[PDB]
């Protein structure tokens, strides 16, 4: 992929490669997302979950949520990519986290971006102001948060009011990744991803991590593509066979539009090439990424 990257850069063909991918991308029915009754459960009329991979709420009322299960078989990791919840779907969103047994939530957007609301304020900002979602009977409380220069890690307590159970949910919020944009640098991106990895949120012992931005495809796709590619090059006899474009197409079989710009695709290569340094044997890179990320 490194020789690929150079040749692509050299030829100034990113937009061409990326466009080929959009052309080859799977096209699956999204009937349920399109039902008349779910119009208000969709943030963007053009971003919908495929029927075969959509996450189903365990409610007879209406089991719909704009969320997709990206099940990467070879990499042995699953991710749920969903849109930034709407004012009326925050209860659904947390019902999904409970039901799917997720341990962590990765937010890659801010609620307001470029003067526009891109996602509801679905978690409490103040410990004393917990949130109650009456429709799904859940309760969410902020226990503590650890704010860094470009991301914030929150410790939340989700309580299922019906069953009296409590679970700790880790919220990993990347606050400076712009819409249709790319992280500041590969190190800052990788320092964030590895933070998520180290927390244990991505382990098979837990349900799929929930990843989202505003539409749940651009930034979310980038994050997931890099993570998956890094797992692949660590599992394969030949760490060089990993084809980023092929992996992305694999992911697009579960949710549409993953990776929204040719530059986000380029950034994914950069991110994976650098991350490979850790995969291939040198753990020191991690410590180096933290320095370059300047989280303090
Ligand atoms: C109101 C609305 O849905 N507007 C639609 C346009 C539309 C489509 C069909 C009919 C009428 C209007 C709309 O803006 N959709 C958005 C969908 C969309 C929103 C946000 C992104 C973001 C890009 C990124 O890097 N991260 S992300 O949160 O996935 C990516 C895609 C768009 N196309 O930009």
UniProtKB/Swiss-Prot annotation:
UniProt-annotated location(s): Endoplasmic reticulum membrane
Membrane topology qualifier: Peripheral membrane protein
Cysteine sulfenic acid (-SOH) found at: 213
GO cellular component terms, semicolon-separated: cytoplasm; cytoplasmic side of endoplasmic reticulum membrane; cytosol; early endosome; endoplasmic reticulum; endosome lumen; glutamatergic synapse; mitochondrial crista
EC number(s) reported in the record: 3.1.3.48
Class of enzymatic activity (EC top level): hydrolase
Catalysis performed (reactions): O-phospho-L-tyrosyl-[protein] + H2O = L-tyrosyl-[protein] + phosphate
Alphabetical UniProt keywords: Acetylation, Endoplasmic reticulum, Hydrolase, Membrane, Oxidation, Phosphoprotein, Protein phosphatase, S-nitrosylation
Modification(s) after translation: Oxidized on Cys-213; the Cys-SOH formed in response to redox signaling reacts with the alpha-amido of the following residue to form a sulfenamide cross-link, triggering a conformational change that inhibits substrate binding and activity. The active site can be restored by reduction.
Membrane-spanning segments: none
Modified residues (Cysteine persulfide): 213
Keyword Aminoacyl-tRNA synthetase set for record: no
Tyrosine-protein phosphatase domain residues: 1-275
List of catalytic residues: 213 (phosphocysteine intermediate)
N,N-(cysteine-1,S-diyl)serine (Cys-Ser) cross-link site: 213-214
Major site of localization recorded for this protein: endoplasmic reticulum
Residues modified to S-nitrosocysteine: 213
Impact when changing residue 179 to A: Substrate-trapping mutant
Phosphotyrosine: residues bearing it: 18, 64
KW Membrane (keyword) present: yes
Cysteine sulfinic acid (-SO2H) sites (modified residues): 213
Binding site for substrate: 179, 213-219, 260
Family, similarity comment: Belongs to the protein-tyrosine phosphatase family. Non-receptor class 1 subfamily.
Function: Tyrosine-protein phosphatase which acts as a regulator of endoplasmic reticulum unfolded protein response. Mediates dephosphorylation of EIF2AK3/PERK; inactivating the protein kinase activity of EIF2AK3/PERK. May play an important role in CKII- and p60c-src-induced signal transduction cascades. May regulate the EFNA5-EPHA3 signaling pathway which modulates cell reorganization and cell-cell repulsion. May also regulate the hepatocyte growth factor receptor signaling pathway through dephosphorylation of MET.
Subunit details: Interacts with EPHA3 (phosphorylated); dephosphorylates EPHA3 and may regulate its trafficking and function. Interacts with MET. Interacts with NCK1.
Protein name: Tyrosine-protein phosphatase non-receptor type 1
Annotated organism of origin: Homo sapiens
């Amino acid at each position: 992929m490194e020789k690929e990257f150079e040749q692509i850069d050299k030829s100034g063909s990113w937009a061409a490669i990326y466009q080929d991918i959009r052309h080859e991308a799977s096209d699956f029915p999204c009937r349920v997302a399109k039902l008349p009754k779910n119009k208000n459960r969709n943030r963007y009329r053009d971003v919908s979950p495929f029927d075969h991979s959509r996450i189903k709420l365990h409610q007879e009322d209406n089991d719909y949520i704009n969320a997709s299960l990206i099940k990467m078989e070879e990499a042995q990791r699953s991710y749920i990519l969903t849109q930034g919840p709407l004012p009326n779907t925050c209860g659904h969103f947390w019902e999904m986290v409970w039901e799917q047994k997720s341990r962590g939530v990765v937010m890659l957007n801010r609620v307001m971006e470029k003067g526009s609301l891109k996602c509801a304020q679905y978690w409490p900002q103040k410990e004393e102001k917990e949130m109650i979602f009456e429709d799904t009977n859940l309760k969410l409380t902020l226990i503590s948060e650890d704010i860094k220069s470009y991301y914030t890690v929150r410790q939340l307590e989700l309580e299922n009011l019906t069953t009296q159970e409590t679970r700790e949910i880790l919220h990993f919020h990347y606050t400076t990744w712009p819409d249709f944009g790319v992280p500041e640098s590969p190190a800052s991106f990788l320092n964030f991803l590895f933070k998520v990895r180290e927390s244990g949120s991505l382990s098979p012992e837990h349900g799929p991590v929930v990843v989202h931005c505003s539409a749940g495809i651009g930034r979310s796709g980038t994050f997931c593509l890099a993570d998956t590619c890094l797992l692949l090059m660590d599992k394969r006899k030949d760490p060089s066979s990993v084809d980023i474009k092929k992996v992305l197409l694999e992911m697009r079989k579960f949710r549409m539009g993953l990776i929204q710009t040719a530059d986000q695709l380029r950034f994914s290569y950069l991110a994976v090439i650098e991350g490979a340094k850790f995969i291939m044997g040198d753990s020191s890179v991690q410590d180096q990424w933290k320095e370059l990320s300047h989280e303090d």
